[PDB]
Design a binder for this molecule. Structure first.
Ligand SMILES: CC[C@]1(COP(=O)(O)OP(=O)(O)OP(=O)(O)O)O[C@@H](n2cc(C)c(=O)[nH]c2=O)C[C@@H]1O
Ligand SMILES: [Mg+2]
Ligand SMILES: [Mg+2]
Length: 539
DNA sequence: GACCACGGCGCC
DNA sequence: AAAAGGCGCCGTGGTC
C-alpha cells in the first residue's frame, strides 16, 4: 500500500497494538489506518486517537474501550471478527480468521490496518445472500459491540475493604480445616494437590475409588465423588469444606480487590463477543459472569458488588427463559400452557425433590431444582440423576420419563433438529445464527451422541442469547436518556446502575423493553429487583 | 518469567 | 464420575 501521512480519510480501517490484551489496562503502542490503497501510520498513537470518528476494523470494540478510557467518544463500527463469527462461530481469534480469509495477524499496526481492510472485503463477499446473517450483523452484533464498549469502560463498584477483612477471616477457617485434614491423614501434605490427595484417600486410607478422570484415567477426587464418600470417613467432609473456602478465596476474595482501576476506582471486565459456539457472550479478566451466589460465603462475596453513592443497582433476570424458548421452537401445547397459566417448573421440581409444599420451596431449593430441570432436558443420564438426588436408579429413571411425556412435542423437535443438522452440517437459532456440528454422523456412538447433545442445545441456548443481545441493543439508548448505566450481562440477566431518584422508573422501563424484545408463542417474564448491592437487588 | 494440559469448580 | 449444554480461572505439575 502507498504510504500516506496521518490522518486517514473518513471510513478508513484501523490497526492498533496494545501492550496487553485488556483494553482498560493496556498501553496503546501503535495506531494506523488503511483505505483507498493507502496506509497512514500515526506518529504518536494517543494523540492520533482524536482524529478518528469511528473504530472500524479487527477488535474494534477493544480500541473503543481504550478510547472511552481516555475520555474520547470513539464508537466501534464494522469488525471482520463479527462477520467471521456469524459465518462460523468457531471463528474466535484474529489469528485464525486472518489465516482463513486472506492474511496474517502480525504485531504491527499498519499491517493490522491493511489486513482489516482486506478481510472485511472478503468476508462481506461471503455474507452476500446470507440475509439472516446480515440481519444479525446489522441489527444485533455491530450495534451490540458499541453497547459492550460502554459497559466495559464503565465498570462496577466493589467494596474492597469489605473483601480484605473477609480474607483474613476465611484464612483462619481454612487453617482449621486443613489442620483437621492433616491430623486425619496422619501427616501433612499439599491439600491443594489432587494428585497427593488421591494417594491419601484411596491408597493410605483405602477408600473406594468411585470414578476416573477423563484424560489421564486417575482416580477422581471430584466433589461428586467425595459426596458419595461422605460417610466413609470424617476427613471427606473436611475436604469438601476446605475446597469451598479455598475456591472462593483464591478465585474471588483475593484477586478482585487488586483489580480496581486507578483512574476509575472501579472493577472492569471484558465482554467477549466472538467467544462461544452458541452465540452467548463470555466475560473475562476478570470473569464477572460467575460471581458466587449459591452458598452463604458466596452470597457474602456477591454483596461486595455495590452501587455508587447516590445510585442503586437494578437487576433484571428472564424467568425460566430457555424453557420458554423451547416452547416456541418445539410448539409443545402443554409447555406453552404452563407459561400461560403462570406455572413455575423450577418450583414444581423443587417441592417434589425436597418433598415440601411449593410455598415451602426456599431459594436454595429452587436453584437445586434448576440444575435438575436443565440437566434432564439436555440429556442427563438416569444414573447420574439418581446419584445427585440420593434416590434409587429406578426412581431417577421414572422422573426422566415423566419429564418428557409431560411435554410430548419436545422429543419430536429434538429429533427433527438433529435430522436437519445431519443434512446441512449445521443447526440454527430462531434468528438463523448457525453452529456447524460435523460429528452428527460420526461412527463412534459416544462421539456422535455428544455431538447430538451439543447440536440440539445450540438452537435453544443460542436463541435465548439472541433475545438478550437484541434487548441490550434496544435498551441501551433508553438508559442513556435517563442518565442510567448498563453494567453487566450474565446470559439472561442485566445489572444496571441508576440514580436513586430514577431507579424505579429505570427498573420498570428495562423490564418492559426486555419482556417485549421479540414476542414469542409464550410471554417472556422478567424478575427485577433494586438494591445497594448485587445480592440485595435480586433478593 | 512464560507456555500448556489437567482436574476441578464457580456461574448461567 | 456418570449421555446435561455453554463458559473462564484456579493450583498443580511439567516444560522451556
Ligand atoms: C441463559 C438461560 C439460563 C438462565 O439461567 P437462570 O436465570 O438461572 O434460570 P432460569 O432463567 O431458567 O429460571 P429463573 O430463576 O426464573 O431465571 O441458563 C441456563 N442454565 C442454568 C442453570 C442454572 C443450569 O444449571 N443449566 C443451564 O443450562 C438455562 C436458563 O434458562
Ligand atoms: Mg433467569
Ligand atoms: Mg439468570
Amino acid at each position: 500500500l502507498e504510504e500516506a501521512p496521518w490522518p486517514p480519510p473518513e471510513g478508513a480501517f484501523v490497526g492498533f497494538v496494545l501492550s496487553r490484551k485488556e483494553p482498560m489496562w493496556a498501553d496503546l503502542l501503535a495506531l494506523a489506518a488503511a483505505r483507498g490503497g493507502r496506509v497512514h501510520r500515526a506518529p504518536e498513537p494517543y494523540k492520533a486517537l482524536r482524529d478518528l470518528k469511528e473504530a472500524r476494523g479487527l477488535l474494534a470494540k477493544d480500541l473503543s474501550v481504550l478510547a472511552l478510557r481516555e475520555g474520547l467518544g470513539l464508537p466501534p463500527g464494522d469488525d471482520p471478527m463479527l462477520l467471521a463469527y456469524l459465518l462460523d462461530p468457531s471463528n474466535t481469534t484474529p489469528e485464525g480468521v486472518a489465516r482463513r480469509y486472506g492474511g496474517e495477524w502480525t504485531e504491527e499496526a499498519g499491517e493490522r490496518a491493511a489486513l482489516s481492510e482486506r478481510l472485511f472485503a472478503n468476508l462481506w463477499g461471503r455474507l452476500e445472500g446470507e440475509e439472516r446473517l446480515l440481519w444479525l450483523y446489522r441489527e444485533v452484533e455491530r450495534p451490540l459491540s458499541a453497547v459492550l464498549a460502554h459497559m466495559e469502560a464503565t465498570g462496577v463498584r466493589l467494596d474492597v475493604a469489605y473483601l480484605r477483612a473477609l480474607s483474613l477471616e476465611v484464612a483462619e477457617e481454612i487453617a482449621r480445616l486443613e489442620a483437621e485434614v492433616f491430623r486425619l491423614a496422619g501427616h501433612p501434605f499439599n491439600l491443594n494437590s489432587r494428585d497427593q490427595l488421591e494417594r491419601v484417600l484411596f491408597d493410605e486410607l483405602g477408600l473406594p475409588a468411585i470414578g476416573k478422570t477423563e484424560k489421564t484415567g486417575k482416580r477422581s477426587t471430584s466433589a461428586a465423588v467425595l459426596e458419595a464418600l461422605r460417610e466413609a470417613h470424617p476427613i471427606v467432609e473436611k475436604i469438601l469444606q476446605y475446597r469451598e473456602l479455598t475456591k472462593l478465596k483464591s478465585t474471588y476474595i483475593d484477586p478482585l480487590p487488586d483489580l480496581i482501576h486507578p483512574r476509575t476506582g472501579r472493577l472492569h471486565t471484558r465482554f467477549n463477543q466472538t467467544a462461544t459456539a452458541t452465540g452467548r457472550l463470555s466475560s473475562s479478566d476478570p470473569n464477572l459472569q460467575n460471581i458466587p451466589v449459591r452458598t452463604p460465603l458466596g452470597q457474602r462475596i456477591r454483596r461486595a458488588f455495590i452501587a455508587e453513592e447516590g445510585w442503586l443497582l437494578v437487576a433484571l433476570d428472564y424467568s425460566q427463559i430457555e424453557l420458554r424458548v423451547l416452547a416456541h421452537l418445539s410448539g409443545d401445547e402443554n409447555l406453552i400452557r404452563v407459561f400461560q397459566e403462570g406455572r413455575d417448573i423450577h418450583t414444581e421440581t423443587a417441592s417434589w425433590m425436597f418433598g415440601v409444599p411449593r410455598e415451602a420451596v426456599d431459594p436454595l431449593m429452587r436453584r437445586a431444582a434448576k440444575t435438575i430441570n436443565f440437566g434432564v432436558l439436555y440429556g442427563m443420564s438416569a444414573h447420574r440423576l439418581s446419584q445427585e438426588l440420593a434416590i434409587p436408579y429406578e426412581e431417577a429413571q421414572a422422573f426422566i420419563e415423566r419429564y418428557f411425556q409431560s411435554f410430548p412435542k419436545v422429543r419430536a423437535w429434538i429429533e427433527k433438529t438433529l435430522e436437519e443438522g445431519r443434512r446441512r452440517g449445521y443447526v440454527e437459532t430462531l434468528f438463523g445464527r448457525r453452529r456447524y456440528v460435523p460429528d452428527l454422523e460420526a461412527r463412534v456412538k459416544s462421539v456422535r451422541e455428544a455431538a447430538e447433545r451439543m447440536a440440539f442445545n445450540m438452537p435453544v441456548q443460542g436463541t435465548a442469547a439472541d433475545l438478550m443481545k437484541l434487548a441490550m441493543v434496544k435498551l441501551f439508548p433508553r438508559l442513556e436518556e435517563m442518565g442510567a448505566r448498563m453494567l453487566l450481562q450474565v446470559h439472561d440477566e442485566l445489572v444496571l446502575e441508576a440514580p436513586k431518584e430514577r431507579a424505579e422508573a429505570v427498573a420498570r422501563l428495562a423490564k418492559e423493553v426486555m419482556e417485549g424484545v421479540y414476542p414469542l408463542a409464550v410471554p417472556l417474564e422478567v424478575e427485577v429487583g433494586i438494591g445497594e448491592d448485587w445480592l440485595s437487588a435480586k433478593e
